[PDB]
Design a protein around this ligand. Structure first.
Ligand code: GNP
Ligand code: MG
Length: 180
């Protein structure tokens, strides 16, 4: 009935990049222009089908990007099946911080094979005006390759662009990690 081997997904990234917006666009297909800043760590669940015939339940964990609001530490990272690294295409420092988030996860999630553990990078706010978008796709692809050929998706939680495609890959990678 209730107890399931869920697929545990952690979403990480700087404050302001749109992690909460992405979680709500994925799980509830809704977008609110103004969410409160996230404090601690909470999750939502979504039942999904992976690649046509596998049913699973995703547990998507949303986290606090601001250090003053990280009041739960990082122990909840353990047991994760996939880690999502979000940057804002309009914010260079959020992009520059992607590897430190990857590495923070790796130190504390106690995964057994860091080299094969699935990461997915999301460059969010691709709907922004072109003049505001300062992180290039080319630059993002270079980083994703350098971190181990991790998948990169450009998204908009606001306009519902590519969040479904991205989480299709998050779900398939999570399931593969969960079952291997
Ligand atoms: N243009 C645009 N703005 C977005 C998009 N997604 C989120 N935003 C804005 O980015 C801002 C931060 O969004 P939010 O989801 O709360 O970010 P967060 O990463 O959860 N912040 P925190 O880490 O503090 O909880 C808000 O102003 C939000 O409206 C998007 O796809 N496009
Ligand atoms: Mg948030």
């Amino acid at each position: 009935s209730r107890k399931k081997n869920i697929l545990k997904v952690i979403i990480l990234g700087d404050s302001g990049v749109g992690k909460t917006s992405l979680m709500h666009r994925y799980v509830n297909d809704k977008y609110s222009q103004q969410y409160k800043a996230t404090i601690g760590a909470d999750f939502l669940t979504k039942e999904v089908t992976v690649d046509g015939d596998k049913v699973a339940t995703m547990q998507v964990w949303d986290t606090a990007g601001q250090e003053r609001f990280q009041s739960l530490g990082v122990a909840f990272y353990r047991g994760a099946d996939c880690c999502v690294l979000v940057y804002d295409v309009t914010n260079a420092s959020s992009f520059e911080n992607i590897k430190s988030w990857r590495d923070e996860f790796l130190v504390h999630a106690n995964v057994n094979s860091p080299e094969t553990f699935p990461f997915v990078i999301l460059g969010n706010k691709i709907d922004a005006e072109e003049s505001k978008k300062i992180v290039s796709e080319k630059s993002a692809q270079e980083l994703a390759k350098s971190l181990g050929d991790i998948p990169l998706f450009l998204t908009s939680a606001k306009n519902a662009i590519n969040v479904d495609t991205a989480f299709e890959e998050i779900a398939r990678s999570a399931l593969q990690q969960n079952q291997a």
